[PDB]
RNA sequence: GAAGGGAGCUUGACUGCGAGACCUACAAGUCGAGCAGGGACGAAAGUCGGGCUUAGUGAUCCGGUGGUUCCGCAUGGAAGG
RNA sequence: GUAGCGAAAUUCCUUGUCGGGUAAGUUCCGACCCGCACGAAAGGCGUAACGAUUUGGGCACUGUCUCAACGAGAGACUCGGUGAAAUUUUAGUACCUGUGAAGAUGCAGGUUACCCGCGACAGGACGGAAAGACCCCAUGGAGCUUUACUGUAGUUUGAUAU
RNA sequence: AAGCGACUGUUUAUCAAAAACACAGGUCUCUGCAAAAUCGUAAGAUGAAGUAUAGGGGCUGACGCCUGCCCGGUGCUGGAA
RNA sequence: GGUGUAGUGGUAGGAGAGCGUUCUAAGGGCGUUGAAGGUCGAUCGUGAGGACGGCUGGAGCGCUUAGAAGUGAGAAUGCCGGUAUGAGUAGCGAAAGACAGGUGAGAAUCCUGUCCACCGUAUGACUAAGGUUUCCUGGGGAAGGCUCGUCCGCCCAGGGUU
RNA sequence: UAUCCGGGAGUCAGACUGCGAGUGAUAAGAUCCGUAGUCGAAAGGGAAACAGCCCAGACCACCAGCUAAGGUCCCAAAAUA
RNA sequence: GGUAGCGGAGAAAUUCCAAACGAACUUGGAGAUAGCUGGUUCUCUCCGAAAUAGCUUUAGGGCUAGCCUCGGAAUUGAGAA
RNA sequence: UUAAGUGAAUAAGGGCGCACGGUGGAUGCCUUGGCACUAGGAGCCGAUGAAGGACGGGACUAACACCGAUAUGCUUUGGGGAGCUGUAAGUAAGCUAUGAUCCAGAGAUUUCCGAAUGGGGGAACCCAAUAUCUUUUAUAGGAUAUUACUUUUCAGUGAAUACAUAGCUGAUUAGAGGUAGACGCAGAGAACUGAAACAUCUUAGUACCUGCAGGAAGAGAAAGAAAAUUCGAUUCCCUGAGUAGCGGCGAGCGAAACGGGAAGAGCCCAAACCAACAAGCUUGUUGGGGUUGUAGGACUCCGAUAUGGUAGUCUGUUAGUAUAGUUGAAGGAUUUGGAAAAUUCCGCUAAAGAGGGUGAAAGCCCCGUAGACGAAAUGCUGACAACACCUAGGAGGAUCCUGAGUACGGCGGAACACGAGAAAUUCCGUCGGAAUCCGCGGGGACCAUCCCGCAAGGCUAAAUACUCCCUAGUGACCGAUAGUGAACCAGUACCGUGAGGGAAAGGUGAAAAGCACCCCGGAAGGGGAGUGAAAUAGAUCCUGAAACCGUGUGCCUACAACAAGUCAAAGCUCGUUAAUGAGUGAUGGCGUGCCUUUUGUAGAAUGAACCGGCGAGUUACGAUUGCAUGCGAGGUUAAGUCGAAGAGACGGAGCCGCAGCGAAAGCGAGUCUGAAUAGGGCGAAUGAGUAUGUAGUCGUAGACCCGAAACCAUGUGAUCUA
């Protein structure tokens, strides 16, 4: 704003006589290079909902997936070593081709690594799952242990 | 502001004072006491756990607004005379903690 | 999230200028003069869509009057006679008959005069 | 039919109020039957909360005087409210 | 309120009255004194010399004027070169009378007027230039004054310490 | 020939050069020296390496003739019951 | 959705519903077989506005739903830039130049010569300050020079202060 | 349609005409009230032009019709009724 | 070379102090304050004022009321003619 | 033929439409650079000469960059492996597998000015002294080292003056100055402004100035908070709360404790007393001793010579880490094309589908990324060890010690939210002036009782504040009038005496392939010919709007009074988004611009020369209402911890609501007034709230934008003028 712009202290010309429009500073907002009136300022956009509303939202997305039958539960995801080709074959076996949220229990590092690089796959741990993740994903591929941990969390 | 006419607060006089030793009590009524079972021992801790009284202020005072129906032993900072009569007529008892 | 001027300004002003085609000099070249003139044109256009009805009724009345005089009658007497005779042909059709079908207009005038006599 | 005038006795030129009204931007202003307390006059009815009615007045802050079963910075006092 | 001076750099009434000067003098000079409202160091009165001081008269001198005429040069004017500015709502931008925010190129009625220029003038465009300095207002500003209010530097007086 | 200013000077750079300022002269008053006065919080300076025939301040303004009355009021100066 | 009846001027101002701009998310698309942008057109909607063609252009951009705003200009003697009007107009800044010859693409303006004219207690000759290479030599004629320029205190390259 | 409750205002320069008064001079396009209208914030028709007068309130299209004020010899629609 | 802005200097004019001096210039407080003037950008639909009262160091400002708008509650329907 | 009547066409110029140019630089797209932050690092540099400069160094050298007479660089240790001699072309001359250029660590050199310090001085210049060395036969000349001031310590000399001291000399010691326009503490300290005026008050202990600093600072180990009975240094966050209070009781100002968290750490002296030393039984130095409020300590008795700890150390050893790096998967064809990454067909890779570049849009072409690996040298951190420094229990009180011109009081100021007020508590100046354990201070005047504590001495990490810089990133942040003033040789040009003010200016093309040659011309500039996908991409170079200027012409225009239009319309010309079409338009009707401000403006009231761009109700924190969602007599978490700068989880301290009435004690569906079971007021009967989102309005902030004359505080000016 005009206070922050460089310079602009003195009065450009006397109040009367010159025949020009009266001015106070070369940095006034109407001047080329003058300060900005209002405009963006640093601030936070984040707010918090009531805990009960948060919980209802999470339950709602998960319930919606189940009702549409887009929730695919697998007995377990084990990879001796991380290999994206093997995980891609796993998706094919499960017949999942659209966007998928892969929910893994904590510590399943090989599964997580092998899946993450696939363009349509979003990997999240059962302890860290959010409304946005579930809603974004068209299908939810979850392991049975992950579902157990989710049920405990909620 | 009233454009120079003497504002209302200026017209009106100050009044009263605040007692330094002022004591306010968290109020409880017989209808709320009905939420408990017969023979139950009602206590400030019990009320706080039940969530009926989150802030007890100087203490719990029991009032006789509603009709009590359960026998209870009630412990509180104070009791209104009507409240004590109602509790005791219901077969309960009152103790001034 | 800055929204610079863009092209909406030019688009809007160009619409006004196109509306002002044919005006005299700056009144079609310059946006401010053009807009001021286009507004007056709108005022005149709305006002004239009403005045136009008046003008043509006036024209028809004058032509009917000339034809009635030739047939031995004034415009006013002709219209009074037609109303008596229950003729609902309006002034537009009457003026058209006077200019184009003189015989038909004369027949209308005869019936009007007969009604007046009765 | 006095609200004008005179005489006797008096102090209602009362205390706590006050349904309901008028007036009104507000703050204010005006009228009020009636209830209770305790009275004046009158045999009684009953009248009396000043004067025939309408002017004779000034918000708040601050301070003085009197009363008060109110408060009293650990407690009892006090200081001060 | 003395001396002195006085219609004055002071006299409103006032071009006071009288005399001088002029054919004619609200100015000027001399005098008078009802000094609206002179006056003795914010000096009174007078004064040789001095003054790009103010005032009146005279001689000389003249285009200052009667009353304008001619001539020289620079600009202006034509041509070649170079080439701004203030102003500017758009303008195909008449006159009279009237009307209208009461003073019209633009509105009404009437009149006049072929199209485009060039050299001149300045009546109008309430012409340009400067958000009027006059006037009023703002619970504006600034400089200044004082026996305005409240302070205060200094100056001084007392107690006290050294 | 009259007014004003004695005079030479000085002044509003850029609308006023004058009758305005200065001036020599007059007068009043302060100041005994670390003088008074002034700059400075102070130190330190000017006054002045001067000393009442000197220095500061106020007024008047060459020269000539003169400068009347009032000390109640306000200042200053002195007094001290 | 249909019918009927009624209603629909409007400043300050209140309410409602929309258009368009940039960006984010998601989805679904379009683009060297030509995106955005620009331009023209006789196109659509009740309005802000939306399409579709031709041309230009040469690499990014729509659409639907939701979200966030530096979100819409014609006026502030507004700021910046560009370009007009006045206008081929004012002005071209105290004074004498003439002609012959030369140079050169081009000469009133540069060089040479002759005459003429001007200053001469200066417009001459020295120096201090200040300026700071403007000095000399050879080139140049974009710009600067109030015209012109072959020329210059200008530009280019060398050199010069013992 | 009135109330009452609440959110958001703007307005505190008014003008003229008719009628009733004051001030003024029984002047003012004056001034100050009361009352009605219009303008303000209202386009259209009439009053030559002419905010406030007369008629009349524009959501739009029409080269249809009937009227209001005001008009009908020509400009200029309609009676040389 | 010296004197510097709460200042200097002034033969005194508010006169000079770097082309505007009743208080220099520059930067900062600073986006001073401005009941004052100017400006404030797309569209359509519904409704639509006021220029008054009271009080005001108040009079071209402001506050409450009056007049407008949006939502709501309720009624023995209380409004208008 | 005569007469009467009618009578087109022509354009000196102009208008409209259209087409094509020019000018100019809007728009679109793009980006060298910015903006706001996050994580980590680093938080100082200087007499061992700094920050910042001047002048120099290149084969050519004007500028920038780098370097300093060892000058476009030197040495050394590592990295890297083919070109390299900057910008920056062009020559010219060279270097490089004997490993160059280049990258990182360490080191050498580092002119002159500048605190600048041998002296001087108008910065980058001048002139010296001493000693050694050097040139000359010799003087002159040259090089090197030392030579400021003050402070510390020491030594010698040494006055008035006898001793002395002062001074002087030398040696020794550590300071000066600059910053990072930030943060901290302190001294000094405004005004505009608000209060609708203004003085108390507010702005505000703010801006400015000055001092001192440190990487943080400050505070800090109770003469405390309290009175639930208890807590146990300090700091900071949430909350208490806009409460209690202060206040021309106005405008406004405004806590603290409790509670919840972040982080946590406690220690030294003085004194008593002891030992030694020295002088003059005390009195100073040294060492021991001892350190406190359930009083401690001395001192006297006993018993232990351990047990633990540390906020120490250029002490190593070790690990990790920072400063270069190495490695790192997978595609070919077909169509369009100048060019493929695009299209189409089949593949392949993925712990790598982050990103950037490549002739258009690439997982598989390149640089990269995931992942793996890597350090000679120098820092940093952590451990381990070493060294070092702290670290005693019990019982007695006879006596001694436990901070004096202090605490405190009067007067005058100031700080505490608290403006002298009833005013504690803290501090300053001045004066007066205590007690000391049976003692002293505090618990908001004061006293008594009770409780809590032990001043007048010192030190102390962490949580906290800030970012000039460095490294790695992020963004519903900017995209050349924006974003830093500065994307570009910017604090430059330019302006000013000076302080100081302060710009403008980005884009050819994929690649210069930057138009050989020819032609007009003195050139400039053009036309060909070429390059190119494109030259109307030709360097004023992407796109190329509008104003403005011009060329061509389809229609109209020289009897007309014109806010320039609109309505009606002949004629002429032309044929589209094919529409009851388009351009022009004789002629006729109606008709005084836009805006602002007004009772009223065409107004002869204001604003705009035109065009383009830019240019004004926003955000944060609170209040309140509507709408929406969740829960519902309940609702909800704040700070903080974990987590991607996310969601989310935990966190119930706290806030709102469920009870009101009263000034208050207090009572309570009632309560207050009152003598009152009266009346009346406010409430209940007669219940919905709360968290969040969103919108309207308001408050605090510049608060919709622009505008004063002015006020105040540092500085710069006597080159004009007095
Ligand atoms: K006289
Ligand atoms: K006089
Ligand atoms: K005479
Ligand atoms: K004279
Ligand atoms: K003179
Ligand atoms: K003459
Ligand atoms: K007017
Ligand atoms: K004229
Ligand atoms: K002034
Ligand atoms: K004089
Ligand atoms: K004199
Ligand atoms: K004299
Ligand atoms: K003179
Ligand atoms: K003078
Ligand atoms: K004299
Ligand atoms: K004197
Ligand atoms: K005097
Ligand atoms: K004198
Ligand atoms: K006297
Ligand atoms: K006296
Ligand atoms: K197009
Ligand atoms: K904005
Ligand atoms: K403008
Ligand atoms: K021009
Ligand atoms: K021109
Ligand atoms: K030459
Ligand atoms: K309302
Ligand atoms: K009237
Ligand atoms: K002078
Ligand atoms: K023509
Ligand atoms: K120096
Ligand atoms: K900083
Ligand atoms: K003040
Ligand atoms: K005010
Ligand atoms: K510290
Ligand atoms: K608060
Ligand atoms: K006040
Ligand atoms: K010890
Ligand atoms: K490639
Ligand atoms: K790529
Ligand atoms: K290391
Ligand atoms: K106090
Ligand atoms: K205490
Ligand atoms: K304590
Ligand atoms: K191109
Ligand atoms: K044309
Ligand atoms: K016409
Ligand atoms: K005017
Ligand atoms: K009662
Ligand atoms: K009651
Ligand atoms: K709700
Ligand atoms: K809300
Ligand atoms: K603001
Ligand atoms: K606001
Ligand atoms: K000077
Ligand atoms: Mg500033
Ligand atoms: Mg002008
Ligand atoms: Mg900017
Ligand atoms: Mg714009
Ligand atoms: Mg009609
Ligand atoms: Mg007490
Ligand atoms: Mg107490
Ligand atoms: Mg006379
Ligand atoms: Mg005479
Ligand atoms: Mg006199
Ligand atoms: Mg005198
Ligand atoms: Mg005199
Ligand atoms: Mg000419
Ligand atoms: Mg008139
Ligand atoms: Mg007229
Ligand atoms: Mg006209
Ligand atoms: Mg005019
Ligand atoms: Mg004028
Ligand atoms: Mg004015
Ligand atoms: Mg004189
Ligand atoms: Mg003289
Ligand atoms: Mg002058
Ligand atoms: Mg003069
Ligand atoms: Mg005098
Ligand atoms: Mg209507
Ligand atoms: Mg775009
Ligand atoms: Mg904007
Ligand atoms: Mg503009
Ligand atoms: Mg002319
Ligand atoms: Mg000349
Ligand atoms: Mg001479
Ligand atoms: Mg020369
Ligand atoms: Mg030459
Ligand atoms: Mg020339
Ligand atoms: Mg009037
Ligand atoms: Mg109005
Ligand atoms: Mg009308
Ligand atoms: Mg009007
Ligand atoms: Mg009819
Ligand atoms: Mg007719
Ligand atoms: Mg007749
Ligand atoms: Mg004066
Ligand atoms: Mg000057
Ligand atoms: Mg301020
Ligand atoms: Mg309406
Ligand atoms: Mg008042
Ligand atoms: Mg090597
Ligand atoms: Mg030196
Ligand atoms: Mg004020
Ligand atoms: Mg440090
Ligand atoms: Mg690879
Ligand atoms: Mg492919
Ligand atoms: Mg205080
Ligand atoms: Mg004291
Ligand atoms: Mg005390
Ligand atoms: Mg204790
Ligand atoms: Mg710390
Ligand atoms: Mg810029
Ligand atoms: Mg651009
Ligand atoms: Mg700039
Ligand atoms: Mg092109
Ligand atoms: Mg171009
Ligand atoms: Mg004619
Ligand atoms: Mg003609
Ligand atoms: Mg007016
Ligand atoms: Mg104008
Ligand atoms: Mg100076
Ligand atoms: Mg000097």
UniProtKB/Swiss-Prot annotation, chain A:
Residues 1-26 are annotated as: Disordered. GO terms for cellular component: ribonucleoprotein complex; ribosome. Keywords: Ribonucleoprotein, Ribosomal protein, RNA-binding, rRNA-binding. It comes from the Bacteria. Residues 8-19 have a biased composition (Basic residues). One of its GO terms (molecular function) is structural constituent of ribosome. Belongs to the universal ribosomal protein uL4 family. One of the primary rRNA binding proteins, this protein initially binds near the 5'-end of the 23S rRNA. It is important during the early stages of 50S assembly. It makes multiple contacts with different domains of the 23S rRNA in the assembled 50S subunit and ribosome. This is Large ribosomal subunit protein uL4. It comes from Enterococcus faecalis (strain ATCC 700802 / V583). The lineage of its organism: Bacteria, Bacillati, Bacillota, Bacilli, Lactobacillales. The gene is rplD.
Swiss-Prot record, chain B:
GO terms for cellular component: cytosolic large ribosomal subunit. One of its GO terms (molecular function) is structural constituent of ribosome. One of its GO terms (biological process) is translation. Keywords: Ribonucleoprotein, Ribosomal protein, RNA-binding, rRNA-binding. It comes from the Bacteria. Part of the 50S ribosomal subunit. Binds to the 23S rRNA. Belongs to the universal ribosomal protein uL15 family. This is Large ribosomal subunit protein uL15. The lineage of its organism: Bacteria, Bacillati, Bacillota, Bacilli, Lactobacillales. The chain holds residues 50 to 146 of 146 of the full protein.
UniProtKB/Swiss-Prot annotation, chain C:
One of its GO terms (cellular component) is ribosome. GO terms for biological process: ribosomal large subunit assembly; translation. The keyword Oxidoreductase does not apply. Gene3D superfamilies: 6.10.160.10, Ribosomal protein L20. Keywords: Ribonucleoprotein, Ribosomal protein, RNA-binding, rRNA-binding. The keyword rRNA-binding applies. GO terms for molecular function: rRNA binding; structural constituent of ribosome. InterPro entries: Ribosomal_bL20 (IPR005813), RIBOSOMAL_L20_CS (IPR049946), Ribosomal_protein_bL20_C (IPR035566). NCBIfam families: rplT_bact. Binds directly to 23S ribosomal RNA and is necessary for the in vitro assembly process of the 50S ribosomal subunit. It is not involved in the protein synthesizing functions of that subunit. This is Large ribosomal subunit protein bL20. The lineage of its organism: Bacteria, Bacillati, Bacillota, Bacilli, Lactobacillales. The gene is rplT.
């Amino acid at each position: 704003n005009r206070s922050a712009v460089r310079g602009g202290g003195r009065k450009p010309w006397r109040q009367k006589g010159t025949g020009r429009a009266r001015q106070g500073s070369i940095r006034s907002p109407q001047w080329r290079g003058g300060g900005v009136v209002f405009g963006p300022t640093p601030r936070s956009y984040s707010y918090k909902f009531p805990k009960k509303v948060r919980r209802l939202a999470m339950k709602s997305v998960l319930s919606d997936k189940v009702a549409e039958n887009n929730l695919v539960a697998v007995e377990g995801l084990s990879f001796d070593a991380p290999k994206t080709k093997e995980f891609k074959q796993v998706l094919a076996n499960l017949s999942i081709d659209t966007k998928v949220l892969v929910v893994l229990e904590n510590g399943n590092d090989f599964a997580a690594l092998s899946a993450r690089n696939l363009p349509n796959v979003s990997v999240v741990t059962s302890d860290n799952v959010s409304v946005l993740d579930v809603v974004s994903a068209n299908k939810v591929l979850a392991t049975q242990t992950a579902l157990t941990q989710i049920e405990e969390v909620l | 502001f009233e454009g120079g006419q003497t504002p209302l607060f200026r017209r009106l006089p100050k009044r009263g004072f605040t007692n330094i030793n002022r004591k306010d009590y968290a109020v409880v009524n017989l209808d709320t006491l009905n939420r408990f079972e017969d023979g139950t021992e009602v206590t400030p801790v019990v009320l706080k756990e039940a969530g009926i009284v989150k802030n007890e202020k100087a203490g719990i005072k029991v009032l006789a607004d509603g009709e009590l129906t359960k026998k209870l032993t009630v412990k509180a900072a104070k009791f209104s005379k009507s409240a004590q009569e109602a509790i005791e007529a219901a077969g309960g008892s009152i103790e001034v903690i | 999230a800055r929204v610079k001027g863009g092209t909406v300004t030019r688009k809007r002003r160009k619409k006004v200028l196109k509306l002002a085609k044919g005006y005299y000099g700056s009144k079609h070249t310059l946006f401010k003069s053009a807009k001021e003139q286009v507004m007056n044109s709108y005022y005149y256009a709305f006002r004239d869509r009403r005045q136009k009805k008046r003008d043509f009724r006036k024209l028809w009345i004058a032509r009917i009057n000339a034809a009635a005089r030739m047939n031995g009658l004034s415009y006013s007497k002709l219209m009074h006679g037609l109303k008596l005779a229950e003729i609902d042909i309006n002034r537009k059709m009457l003026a058209d008959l006077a200019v184009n079908d003189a015989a038909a207009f004369t027949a209308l005038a005869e019936q009007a005069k007969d009604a007046l006599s009765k």
